[PDB]
Amino acid sequence: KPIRALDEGDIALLKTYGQSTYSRQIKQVEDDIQQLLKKINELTGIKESDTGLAPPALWDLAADKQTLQSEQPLQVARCTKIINADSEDPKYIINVKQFAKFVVDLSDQVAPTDIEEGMRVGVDRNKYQIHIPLPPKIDPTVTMMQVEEKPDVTYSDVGGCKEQIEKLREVVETPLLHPERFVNLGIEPPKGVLLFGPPGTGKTLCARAVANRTDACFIRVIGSELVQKYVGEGARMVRELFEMARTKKACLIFFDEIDAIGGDNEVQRTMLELINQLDGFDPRGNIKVLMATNRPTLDPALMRPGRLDRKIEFSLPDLEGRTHIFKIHARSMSVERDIRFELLARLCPNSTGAEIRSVCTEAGMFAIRARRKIATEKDFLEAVNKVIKSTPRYMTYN
Amino acid sequence: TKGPDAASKLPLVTPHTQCRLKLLKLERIKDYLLMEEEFIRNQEQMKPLEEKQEEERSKVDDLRGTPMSVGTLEEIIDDNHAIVSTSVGSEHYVSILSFVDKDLLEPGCSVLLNHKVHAVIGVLMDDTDPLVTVMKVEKAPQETYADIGGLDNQIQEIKESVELPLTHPEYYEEMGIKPPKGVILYGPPGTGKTLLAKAVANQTSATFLRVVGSELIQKYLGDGPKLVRELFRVAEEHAPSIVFIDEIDAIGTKRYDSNSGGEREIQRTMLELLNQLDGFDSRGDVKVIMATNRIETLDPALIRPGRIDRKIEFPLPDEKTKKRIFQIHTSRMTLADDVTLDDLIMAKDDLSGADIKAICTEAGLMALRERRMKVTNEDFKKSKENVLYKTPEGLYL
Amino acid sequence: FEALGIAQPKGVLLYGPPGTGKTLLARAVAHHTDCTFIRVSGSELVQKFIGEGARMVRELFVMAREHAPSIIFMDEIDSIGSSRLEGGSGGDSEVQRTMLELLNQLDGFEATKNIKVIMATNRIDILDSALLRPGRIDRKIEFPPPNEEARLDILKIHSRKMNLTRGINLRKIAELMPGASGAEVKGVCTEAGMYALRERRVHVTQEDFEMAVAKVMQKDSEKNMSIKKLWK
Amino acid sequence: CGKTMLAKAVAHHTTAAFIRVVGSEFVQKYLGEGPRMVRDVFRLAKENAPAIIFIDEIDAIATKRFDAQTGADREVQRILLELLNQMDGFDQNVNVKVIMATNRADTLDPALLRPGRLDRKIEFPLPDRRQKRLIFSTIT
């Protein structure tokens, strides 16, 4: 049936008749409210907008003007191949960022010994002479770094990696704290070791655990940090890091998620710098390196013998390991003292350690849901039901 | 640091039958808005206060010059020189003038520089580029938890994630569980994920930032990660805050070896987003909410327990939730006494909140077709198959 | 719409076989509206530069909002918004980013007002479920091939400017078109005019329309009777 | 059988501006460049005098549409869709006649094979007797 479009009289009668008596007043009032809101919003202004002006009496405006009229700015750049100067060809080609690259010479104020390939250099703007090398500095405040000297994770805080922790002990504790046995055995202590396994197995903290018990400082370096914005200078960064590794009495240098690097000009520069630092530093030293990855993408030039002596697989935790992790993470939360953690570890087959920590977190979540200050075994049951498993298994298996 | 944002007006929404209780409350609100307007117009009418220092400020302005370019303080050197990047992307080794607040200088904060011979002459704590300013919510959405039907478990979870740490959090550290840093809602389209985000932004006490995911990607090199960094820096600066990134799969797809420059830039932007997500401690009062339909297509690193612990499921509404949504959306309708609405719900289908809203809208349209506004049950009968477009019959019986 | 308590419908999709009036209906709507009609026909939102498609979508909706209640016509929406593909590698992602931005502008956090939008496609089934979702796209209007009466009307519009002859029965011509699209009807009118032009005349006769129907609707069939006789 | 030669002759014997293109030329590397080229070609033809667009080997881009499951097929179908929307889309073109030649018409998208877009689908069969005599004469 052809439906009729509303006519003018139809529209006019629709807006009336079946209307609330207060339609006009209410709609108008809401419109004025919105208009007044926009009025206030436009008239209230912005305010400061207070620039970084120091308190007075700290101002040397005379000297400030002197610097403005005397000192000059320098564009920074990443210096590249030295062109084999030998005091007669001191030119280097430098890449000023997204700007061009120029072959330039030095300023009289810098010796060539201070300038080398791959360091940030501040240069002038017309002659582009390298005026001052600009080392990127090292500080845990920037990026993320080792930020640890004596980790608070002990051998009692690790579980499920008994064979793995034993292998790690042979790797690090035996050459470091017992060099005499390696020396009189006439065997080079393990120069390189790799710790491969799925993420969340626990790998990092395991090393951190031994880092507390090896009486040496722990180093955390993230491969993504080397590959993200902190790329380029990162080589020099690790240079300084390796340098400070030499300064300390013993360093447990470890790189997190090396997959971001092991699998790219500046990335290759950082890699070859790592190769020089490892193959160059004397294997008899005490700064033994711990390597770990999730994807066993590593370049074939790395695991050649003499760079990675041992490989350790960190498999998923077993029943004893999973229940140990459950108890460890329950030590830090308010629960009853009669929780069957063996039950839960059974209920979490092939579950990562991070998954166990999340399970404990969700158990606390459920306890909070009922506003009970003590988490119950029921709470952990719902937590594992939620996290793990992301009729069939009960109507056929019994 | 500063404080949160997203000011909103009165809920009102206590009456809806337009019974002058609405009129009285709205007149009170309008009266207060009028006193706003009059008070500020009077204050601007008489407010003589200026000059005072003048000369020192005048000479410092002369030293600064005009115009002054803003850059990003990428790094600092001995406390007279720094490294500052212009918005183009070029950074220079410049000098720092005395009148700058050496305590304010940190890697990242915007620095006012001299146009010629670049030199740090000021610090701007409110750069907030127009894009990220847009992503910050100013007017709270009118939707609220009253408008949400069902999803009681979902509402409970989202409040336990983003509200309980904001309100009294003592339960969290009392149990010692770290607060859930970030939450991802997911489910079939039109289940209510964005609606739940709106309701959160309504009943809130923190800066709400709405993002589109695809908004983050920017044409220019490094603009993407820079914008993501700016967004999260604004989140920290106006902490506590909630960063809602709708349609996370706009960037959240599985990471693969990039070939072209653009795909490398997309990988960089997602890497920066993940780095910013890792950057702030979970004990911090900044949370993120990411919604998507294709959860299965997300990178299995973004949803790691160390990055996003929770995973809220938005399943298709049940029959009771369906009737709840029908009641909600039919609240403003003048339904007759013949309507039952039970037949539509009892029909085994895959109606969603959006589907039910559209069914109500189409029923209203059908009623308007018959020149009526009372909306019979037959209107809903027609509308259901009108909007629900598209097992071989007797195969299963 | 306010008095009824309903929410204002926002989007509409015109889907059907290739050539039925979808683009024609959009053209008519543009001609007979006071709204600022916007033609954003598909694949115009696919730029080489990264993220530019989403930016153009955002600018398009902001600019539509800035103007009066606007109409946006996304012709051949099948191009950009088709279906989000799993993962990347060889999969398309930038177009999907643009599509996701379009979805969010259509129904996201902001809830745009008076931005009624029309989309057209010949293949509705392959469109993304998040795009066909009601509230983003309501009233999925189908344009079926015209029936005999409608074909008669279409013939009469497209024969309005011809120089017909007395005794022409356009009803018979419409009957000569089992399941013919409107575009095919216009093509038949054009071919009848061509037949008249060949003989250097200005009027068209019934036989001209008959052979025009024969030529336009001609299609290759199954030559092999053995293949055609598999089914009973 | 004479398709590209008939196009060559049409280009020779015409006052129109002729835009010769080939289907494989449309498929560009960078995303969205193919549809942009299609739009540019049709815009140029529109802005010029009555013009002719000849697209040899149209089956490069105008094969029947299907559920593309990768970026390449999606981009090719985007090129085809842009061609459709330019030929008979919203903004109609004036005095812009397109000619497209193919060896396998049955694989073309039906949206391209409908009146308003391709009014006449002329078949070029192998020469039959008399036609063979004409060919032999005109080449001899």
Binding site: A100 | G89, Y220, S260, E263 | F49 | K29, Y30, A72
Partner: peptide, 16 residues
């Protein structure tokens, strides 16, 4: 194997 992927483009503005 049957990759056949397109390519995007992100320009970098440069000047001094």
């Amino acid at each position: 194997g049957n990759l056949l992927f397109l390519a995007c483009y992100c320009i970098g503005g440069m000047s001094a």
